[PDB]
């Protein structure tokens, strides 16, 4: 069986103010990218990039009118979101005199 509703009316719908609607977007996509983004940060970093990449995605949504798929616009804020974690960590930690804390991301 398969649901009436889909990324096209349900992408609209949070744009119309219904954020719930975006709960229930994300989920249909929380294990689609949370099984590429796994790609770019380890399990243990993997689900909180995920969290990051829909509190990203929500915030650049109420600016997406690309009249294209959701699933491609979708799938490029996790792998950025998990580029940019790495490099957050790996180049504010390198500060530090070396024998200690000196491992970075790269």
Do not use: C
């Not at 950025?80 to 491992?103: D, I």
């Amino acid at each position: 069986m398969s649901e009436q509703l889909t990324d096209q009316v349900l992408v609209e719908r949070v744009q119309k103010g219904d954020q719930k609607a975006f709960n229930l977007l994300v989920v249909r996509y929380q294990h689609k990218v949370a099984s590429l983004v796994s790609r770019y940060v380890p399990s243990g970093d993997v689900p909180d990039v995920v969290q990051e990449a829909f509190i990203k995605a929500y915030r650049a949504l109420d600016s997406f009118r690309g009249d294209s798929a959701f699933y491609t616009w979708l799938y490029r804020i996790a792998v950025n979101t998990a580029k940019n974690y790495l490099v957050a960590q790996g180049r504010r930690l390198e500060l530090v005199p070396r024998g200690s804390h000196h491992h970075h991301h790269h």
